[PDB]
Ligand SMILES: O=C(O)[C@H]1CCCN1C(=O)C(CS)CS
């Protein structure tokens with residue numbers, strides 16, 4: 001279930017995988033949830049996405065210390081928006097190595113974010129260049145093309161049924177495709193489909209602004225994105 005830890009929520013998704021959830025008032029929209037992931041890889045922990053704020057992100061690290069009690073080797077953030085990179089300083093204060101798409105690091109200052117320390121680059125087929133993602137263990141990082149943003153990246157967790165679409169994917173029951181302020185409306189549908197094709201066996205799709213869902217999240221998101229063109 002949903003473990004409440006201060007103002008955050010944690011949910012175990014698999015033996016070594018948890019979802020972190022944090023909330024921010026978006027004046028005119030209410031308190032918006034954002035999800036990321038925590039993965040135990042043997043004797044270390046890997047984080048996908050910060051919380052919205054430094055204070056919330058320090059609480060993620062607090063929860064990890066209580067519930068896992070192993071060092072956080074690295075974090076990867078999935079685009080330069082506040083829900084994914086707003087807590088970078090908390091990671092850096094904690095001594096955690098940080099990674100983002102090169103383009104996310106380029107965009108970070110203008111988006112009001114602190115850049116990650118390290119930049120990922122991607123091959124033509126979308127897979128991360130392995131030299132740029134050293135020691136990523138089971139995290140398989142894929143750039144699906146521009147969609148939710150120009151820099152959005154996605155992450156599969158090897159050894160599990162899980163793939164993380166970040167803010168690119170909404171759930172199968174979503175009424176509409178939101179969070180589109182920086183979206184690439186022409187390429188969105190293809191990028192959503194490319195995410196699905198990159199992780200063809202993943203049966204649990206995790207995303208920033210919906211609870212985990214089946215692969216119908218991907219098909220439904222892509223279908224709605226077809227209407228943006
Ligand atoms: O408000 C929007 O449309 C876009 C563009 C600016 C940030 N954004 C978001 O939705 C937030 C979550 S509220 C980050 S994914």
Ligand SMILES: [Zn+2]
Nearest residue numbers: 079081148167
């Ligand atoms: Zn975003």
Ligand SMILES: [Zn+2]
Nearest residue numbers: 083167179208
């Ligand atoms: Zn988001």
